[PDB]
Amino acid sequence: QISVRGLAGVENVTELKKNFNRHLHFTLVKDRNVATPRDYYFALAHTVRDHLVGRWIRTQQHYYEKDPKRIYYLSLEFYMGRTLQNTMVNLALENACDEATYQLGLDMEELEEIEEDAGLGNGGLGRLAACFLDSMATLGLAAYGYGIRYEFGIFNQKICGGWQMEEADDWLRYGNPWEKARPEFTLPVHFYGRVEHTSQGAKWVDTQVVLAMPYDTPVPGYRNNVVNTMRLWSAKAPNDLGYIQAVLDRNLAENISRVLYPNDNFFEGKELRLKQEYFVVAATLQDIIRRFKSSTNFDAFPDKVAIQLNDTHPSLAIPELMRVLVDLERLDWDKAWEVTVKTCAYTNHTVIPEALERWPVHLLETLLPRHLQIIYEINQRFLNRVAAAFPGDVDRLRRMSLVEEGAVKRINMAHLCIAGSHAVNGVARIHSEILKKTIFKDFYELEPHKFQNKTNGITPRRWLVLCNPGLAEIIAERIGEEYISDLDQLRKLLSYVDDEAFIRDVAKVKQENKLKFAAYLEREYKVHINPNSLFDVQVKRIHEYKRQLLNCLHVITLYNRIKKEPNKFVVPRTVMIGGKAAPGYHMAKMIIKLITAIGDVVNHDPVVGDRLRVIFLENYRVSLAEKVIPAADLSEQISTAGTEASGTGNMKFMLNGALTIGTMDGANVEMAEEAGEENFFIFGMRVEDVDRLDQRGYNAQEYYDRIPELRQIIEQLSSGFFSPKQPDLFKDIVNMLMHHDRFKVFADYEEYVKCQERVSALYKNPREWTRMVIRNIATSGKFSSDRTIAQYAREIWGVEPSRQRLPA
Amino acid sequence: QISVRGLAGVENVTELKKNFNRHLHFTLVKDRNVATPRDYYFALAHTVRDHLVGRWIRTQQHYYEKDPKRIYYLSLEFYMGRTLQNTMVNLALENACDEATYQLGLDMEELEEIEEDAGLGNGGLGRLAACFLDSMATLGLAAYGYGIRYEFGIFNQKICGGWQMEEADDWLRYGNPWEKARPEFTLPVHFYGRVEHTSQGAKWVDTQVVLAMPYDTPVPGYRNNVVNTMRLWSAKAPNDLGYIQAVLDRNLAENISRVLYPNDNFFEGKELRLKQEYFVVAATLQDIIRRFKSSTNFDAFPDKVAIQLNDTHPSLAIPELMRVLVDLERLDWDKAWEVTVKTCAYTNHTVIPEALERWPVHLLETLLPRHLQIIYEINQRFLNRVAAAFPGDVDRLRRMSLVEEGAVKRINMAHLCIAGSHAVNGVARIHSEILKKTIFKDFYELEPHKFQNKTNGITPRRWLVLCNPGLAEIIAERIGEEYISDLDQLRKLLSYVDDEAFIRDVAKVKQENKLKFAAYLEREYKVHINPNSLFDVQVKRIHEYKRQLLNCLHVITLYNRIKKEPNKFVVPRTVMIGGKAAPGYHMAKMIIKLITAIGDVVNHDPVVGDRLRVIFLENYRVSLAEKVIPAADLSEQISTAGTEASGTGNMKFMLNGALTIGTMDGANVEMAEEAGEENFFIFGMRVEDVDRLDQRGYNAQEYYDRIPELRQIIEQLSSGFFSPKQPDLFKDIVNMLMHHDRFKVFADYEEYVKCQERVSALYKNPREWTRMVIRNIATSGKFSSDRTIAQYAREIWGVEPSRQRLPA
Numbered sequence A, B: 001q002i003s004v005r006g007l008a009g010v011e012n013v014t015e016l017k018k019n020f021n022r023h024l025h026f027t028l029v030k031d032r033n034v035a036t037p038r039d040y041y042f043a044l045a046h047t048v049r050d051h052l053v054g055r056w057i058r059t060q061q062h063y064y065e066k067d068p069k070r071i072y073y074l075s076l077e078f079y080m081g082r083t084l085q086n087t088m089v090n091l092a093l094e095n096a097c098d099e100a101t102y103q104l105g106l107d108m109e110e111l112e113e114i115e116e117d118a119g120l121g122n123g124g125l126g127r128l129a130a131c132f133l134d135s136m137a138t139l140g141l142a143a144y145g146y147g148i149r150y151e152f153g154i155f156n157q158k159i160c161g162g163w164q165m166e167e168a169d170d171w172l173r174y175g176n177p178w179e180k181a182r183p184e185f186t187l188p189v190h191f192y193g194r195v196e197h198t199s200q201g202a203k204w205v206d207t208q209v210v211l212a213m214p215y216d217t218p219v220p221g222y223r224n225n226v227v228n229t230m231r232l233w234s235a236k237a238p239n240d241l242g243y244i245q246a247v248l249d250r251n252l253a254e255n256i257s258r259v260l261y262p263n264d265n266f267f268e269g270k271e272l273r274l275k276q277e278y279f280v281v282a283a284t285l286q287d288i289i290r291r292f293k294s295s296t297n298f299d300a301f302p303d304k305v306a307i308q309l310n311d312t313h314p315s316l317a318i319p320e321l322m323r324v325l326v327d328l329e330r331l332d333w334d335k336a337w338e339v340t341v342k343t344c345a346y347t348n349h350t351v352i353p354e355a356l357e358r359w360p361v362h363l364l365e366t367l368l369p370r371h372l373q374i375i376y377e378i379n380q381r382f383l384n385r386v387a388a389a390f391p392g393d394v395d396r397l398r399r400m401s402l403v404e405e406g407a408v409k410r411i412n413m414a415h416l417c418i419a420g421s422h423a424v425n426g427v428a429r430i431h432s433e434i435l436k437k438t439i440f441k442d443f444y445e446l447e448p449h450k451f452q453n454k455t456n457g458i459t460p461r462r463w464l465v466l467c468n469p470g471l472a473e474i475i476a477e478r479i480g481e482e483y484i485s486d487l488d489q490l491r492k493l494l495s496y497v498d499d500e501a502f503i504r505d506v507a508k509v510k511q512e513n514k515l516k517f518a519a520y521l522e523r524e525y526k527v528h529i530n531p532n533s534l535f536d537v538q539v540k541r542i543h544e545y546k547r548q549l550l551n552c553l554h555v556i557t558l559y560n561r562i563k564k565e566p567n568k569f570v571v572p573r574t575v576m577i578g579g580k581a582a583p584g585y586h587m588a589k590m591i592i593k594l595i596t597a598i599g600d601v602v603n604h605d606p607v608v609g610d611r612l613r614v615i616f617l618e619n620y621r622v623s624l625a626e627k628v629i630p631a632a633d634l635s636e637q638i639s640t641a642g643t644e645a646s647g648t649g650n651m652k653f654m655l656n657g658a659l660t661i662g663t664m665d666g667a668n669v670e671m672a673e674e675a676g677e678e679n680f681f682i683f684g685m686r687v688e689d690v691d692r693l694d695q696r697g698y699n700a701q702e703y704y705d706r707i708p709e710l711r712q713i714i715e716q717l718s719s720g721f722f723s724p725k726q727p728d729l730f731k732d733i734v735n736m737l738m739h740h741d742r743f744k745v746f747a748d749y750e751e752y753v754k755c756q757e758r759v760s761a762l763y764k765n766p767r768e769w770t771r772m773v774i775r776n777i778a779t780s781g782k783f784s785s786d787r788t789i790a791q792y793a794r795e796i797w798g799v800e801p802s803r804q805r806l807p808a
């Protein structure tokens, strides 16, 4: 059908159809007369999977022969989403399969919707891991993704009475055709026990043992025949056992890989979570070393191994690597430490205090006794270095210690990471500067060379070609298909900004996406949106710093203004807000309720008509993002300046033809810088403005007294205007806004509303709106994860990326 | 290589080899240079599996079209063993695969040993289910085996210090290629709740829900292209959910199908066990009814459905069927009951009191409230019938009640079964007569027509062709291969009893089996048996009624006699005793220890040389039985008369060329009757003898005082002769033997020892021993499960078996 979607081919198509039938018959054991749609999905999934195996085996074969430096990406999260379509795209089988399935009388799109999302992530951090795997494979790097195979990923969100209800994400129920169990690589992981000191050194003994079984999932590069591996560990109990109970208690050990903690940028010092962090770390390292010894001095270890820590979650890799080298390989501490620092690198993802991992000493003391001793030793030698560089600065020592004193002694994992890594990077220029000027100022002054920046990016394969084939096509029609793996080329579209034909096509693709999505809402959610209105969407995890509330205030303002002048003209808008709230985050759940409550009032007001609709996008996840983003006109990125490290959703919207309204926060700064501030809708306080507001003191009351429209909104919330049967339902919201708002929602209200008016004014001029859109798309090249990965490779891992196709 | 093993074939072999490679490449994702032996086993397993699918789909297709009466075999146990070789045999692919694997440079036997046993059974009862499935498929019956898919089957037994150590049987760890998950047939099962009475009748409400997911395993008939199904249910928690714990608590619901209770002929009133019994029953019935409505009056239900209860374990099918018909389909009680009785049949497996299921009323009251009411109602109407037939016999009423009074009110499930079934059968003639004369005398007098006998049998496919191809061949060489599916033809061998060539061949096959097994013991168990000695083996679950102890007394006698006259000649013997002891059955575990203790003394006595060896066969199971049985010369079947309902191991030994020494118990009676008492080594008390011994009173001391040799043995056990470091280790054994032996071990000692001497005398005459052997094999035809199943079909289910081959 469309060019960028691959060639069909007589032989190719008849080859797929026959294999589809082989699998339906032999693999699923069924015939066309009893086959269920799920059966069809599986037949196709196995057929496509077969085209990966040859390349997967030869790629892993290639690395064994050439023996290149290996990149190990450790993360407790891999927000993969669906993989059927992504695999077809990277293999160029999309049109062929579409045709073959067509001839077999089946709609492929219907079959793809049957696939369960691999929701092994919470949000930004886990999606970055997923995009990185794709880019690493597309750039020919010998990379391995390592994490945990959770039986249950992020929970499925259902709204009842306007409230969020959590449901277990049993994604493995019908089976996963993409994974391959490798029982022969099972390894033991130790917990508890005690440390024994002998003549030969320390000995960790009397430990409880848990087995780690790996499941490999293929990761195809884009049209280069490279297939890397993502290895996920699963917890199994040893077989070595009144009798019934002993057998049933095996579930205790296997609960380690049972469920993903649903926290987004928030620390929970639970034991189960620590066990998970050590489990993935211990099993991965043994696999790493094993693979290494098959190439005994570890002096060459750093030249053959690079270990990237995605946040502090896998920070135990540092003391674990030391333990093995010192306790097992018998290297001397200093040599061991040199090796450790040279192979490990750390990526920081946030600056908010509640997200920092600080594990109680008593917990590490019981669970990982030897690791605690190693951490103390690391701390000792590290503070000796600080003391020597900054003589007499006793305060600096307390601040830099990996150990935090107080009622409860804790270990600061972020400090552990900085000390044990040769590189520490932020995820956006502004975030990286803040790390050097605030949070890690002391460390930066001690070792300025370790700190770097690596602005995040997204993969143009899944986030453009896959989710917006219509836009990918009209772009390919003018500049070719090379940009798909070299997004910078998108700049060439800059000379089509005045092209009438292009303007019409870009505007038409968007319109089509909106129509398709507008229908989607009625089908599986029976709604009533007007596809001619402006699609105003804010989708991301629900959090106070994200300020979904500021968005809510604007929506209530629009409503009040309409009611004030019913017969005045206003640009119609469909406001969509979606995202999951972590269970137990009360405020976050109150916000979802408030949003649905507003929709309940606004959506049923005869006077408003279809000029304003408020929709809460239920169960937001990767597969839903692939749908709503291509259909958006306005991207809401309004976090208080200095709180959103980088953000990646913002890049998704820019690449897909939506305009951005946001603060100078995270990557927003670099995006506006690339497109030109005039092509961005920037508003609100900048970082410094937040700073001198705190020094002076934030008094929300001041804004309430000076802004009539704001005052009215607050009075409506308090009086029960949005909760008739429960007048004080939102007393907590108002209370927080008026007396304890850490994120200064009122401070940016006026500027936000005004900027929103300029957005509406521009939407009234279709041609100019679209021309600004073209300028955003044309400059979104920098935000491709290919660029990001190429920088990590050259500036951190010390390996050269290659686009050379591997033999077919 | 051998005739009965199928034809190779040019096309056939090159077709297997290529498919073997397809699977190794595409299914296991590997190449010959990294493939592990397990990988090879799986490639072959998937290849063979592919040859089943066509027939499996057409067989199930056939039944749908013809719509024959369906047989549902309910059992909580299916002792399947390995299925790779069995499948090849029934498909006649054994030689072809052997050749194809040979050409690929692989030893098939080595690959078969990699397969895990499906140990979803304890012993006799579960193996009978397995043999029945094979026969039902071989006789073209539209039969379905229904049970539970236990994550952990019978535990693996390991001996340490002479003691039994239990290990979890994690048989699904590497995966099961034979099963097929059918998520679309998932059904809900209810527990707890309460009964609500309305205008429309009773309503079971506020129940906890557990889902039942089926996994189908193919069951191939012998060379007839029929492939039946064994559907095993797995417990899953519903998805409808502080947050972490709720997710982790899902394991509570899923623990229902986690492990098989390891009890052999012993009742454990545990809640988990009851839940298992209802779980398999409720899910199976819904499946049965669903399939029925697709052929609404249930008057025809009994003509289209037969439900066989393997013991009382699935007895809840009776009140469950009533519940559905009355509470859901709204039929009137009497009609419902007529239907129930006509579709259900019950098979009794034992008469020992400790095996009878008596569930506490309070348990059924909490877990299955409505079922308790239905049982009470059934009991009421049933006793009204007894009262009418036996006016004034108040005692008879108490005895027959399904409800047993006392400190704790219980429900007698066996009484429930008799009342709700149109047929009740014993498993051996003598066992069935005992049911009518004792245990169920009252029921028999009330309804003599319900009671029947169906002597057990074993499948000649697995128990001859598969485990003893050498014997199968030399027999086929003279009478053809028709006997494999018509064992009666084995009688034709009766006219070869004087044939010199046959005598030499039969004796040679045995010798070969003994050599192969004698080596096996050294390889994986590093032992030292003499293959020229008589193989004396007793393999079965360890139990006091089985009297492994009587065997022990004989072994100690032989030893003491040798030590008395060291230079006297005695026929050398290798005594093998194997079997698992249920955990918590103290006495059973003491017996295993005693056996190993004897071996420790006997096996290291220089004076004994290799004239006497005592070996304890570790981890006895189906796959081990297939090895030791073909190699045995003497089969020990010495249970106290009247305790072993039937036995099936006895039939296995007879079919494989071993002579039998045993009591007139269970099927032993019918076997000796078929071969002729002169060709059997019968000894000990008969049922009546046990009876007048009890009436008089059993005084073990009397035997101890009158038998010098017996006295010496007891003194040795007490003095610590077999436990030097622990003098009173066996004080409990002696105590039980002397004061509380329910099984009268001493009563049969003298006769047992003497009979054992006649066995030795016969072994000294090779030619005559072998001629007697031929007479046993030649008459073992009656014990084929094909005969057994044909009788169930005609006399109980009302369906005609057929040997007609189904189109290929």
Ligand SMILES: OC[C@H]1O[C@@H]2O[C@H]3[C@H](O)[C@@H](O)[C@@H](O[C@H]4[C@H](O)[C@@H](O)[C@@H](O[C@H]5[C@H](O)[C@@H](O)[C@@H](O[C@H]6[C@H](O)[C@@H](O)[C@@H](O[C@H]7[C@H](O)[C@@H](O)[C@@H](O[C@H]8[C@H](O)[C@@H](O)[C@@H](O[C@H]9[C@H](O)[C@@H](O)[C@@H](O[C@H]1[C@H](O)[C@H]2O)O[C@@H]9CO)O[C@@H]8CO)O[C@@H]7CO)O[C@@H]6CO)O[C@@H]5CO)O[C@@H]4CO)O[C@@H]3CO
Pocket: A373, A376, A377, A379, A380, A383, A384, A387, A397, A398, A401, A402, A403, A404
């Ligand atoms: O594995 C090492 C030890 O681990 C564990 O210790 C951890 C603590 O439990 C944890 O609380 C935290 O320590 C913090 C501490 O609690 C806070 O009080 C604070 O401490 C600062 C203090 O307030 C400042 O005064 C200053 O200390 C200076 C000190 O006053 C000054 O005298 C000098 O110190 C020199 C010593 O005087 C001199 O004897 C010599 O010390 C040798 C030592 O003899 C030798 O054995 C070896 O150290 C051994 C040690 O002896 C063992 O006891 C064992 O220690 C472990 C603890 O038991 C654990 O509880 O093993 C050690 C091996 O490393 O080597 C020493 C020299 O390296 O030289 C000293 C010169 O440095 O100068 C210091 C300047 O630092 O600073 C203190 C730190 O800011 O803050 C602490 C950090 O948060 O973390 C501990 C692990 O780091």
Ligand SMILES: OC[C@H]1O[C@@H]2O[C@H]3[C@H](O)[C@@H](O)[C@@H](O[C@H]4[C@H](O)[C@@H](O)[C@@H](O[C@H]5[C@H](O)[C@@H](O)[C@@H](O[C@H]6[C@H](O)[C@@H](O)[C@@H](O[C@H]7[C@H](O)[C@@H](O)[C@@H](O[C@H]8[C@H](O)[C@@H](O)[C@@H](O[C@H]9[C@H](O)[C@@H](O)[C@@H](O[C@H]1[C@H](O)[C@H]2O)O[C@@H]9CO)O[C@@H]8CO)O[C@@H]7CO)O[C@@H]6CO)O[C@@H]5CO)O[C@@H]4CO)O[C@@H]3CO
Pocket: B373, B376, B377, B379, B380, B383, B384, B387, B397, B398, B401, B402, B403, B404
């Ligand atoms: O669902 C039915 C009931 O279920 C539950 O009851 C069970 C008991 O809990 C459990 O213990 C066991 O019962 C045993 C009992 O505990 C023992 O004591 C013993 O009882 C025997 C007794 O010792 C003997 O004397 C003899 O009883 C005779 C009786 O003495 C004599 O009078 C005559 O009985 C006639 C009645 O007199 C007459 O009124 C009439 O009864 C009607 C009844 O009116 C009508 O409602 C209906 O029965 C209802 C009943 O009324 C409800 O209470 C309800 O009963 C349930 C219990 O509540 C549960 O606890 O529902 C019933 C619906 O079936 O129909 C009755 C007639 O069928 O006619 C009677 C003529 O039969 O004769 C009897 C002769 O039997 O024998 C007793 C039994 O041997 O042994 C009991 C069995 O172990 O089991 C109970 C369920 O079976």
Ligand SMILES: *Cc1c(COP(=O)(O)O)cnc(C)c1O
Pocket: A122, A123, A124, A127, A539, A540, A541, A620, A621, A622, A625, A646, A647, A648, A649, A650, A652
């Ligand atoms: C891209 C993405 C995110 C990250 O969004 P931000 O707005 O940067 O927080 C979160 N969830 C999903 C499903 C995503 O696709």
Ligand SMILES: *Cc1c(COP(=O)(O)O)cnc(C)c1O
Pocket: B122, B123, B124, B127, B539, B540, B541, B620, B621, B622, B625, B646, B647, B648, B649, B650, B652
């Ligand atoms: C045949 C068999 C049994 C039954 O043996 P009996 O001696 O009748 O109790 C038990 N276990 C296995 C493994 C069997 O093969």
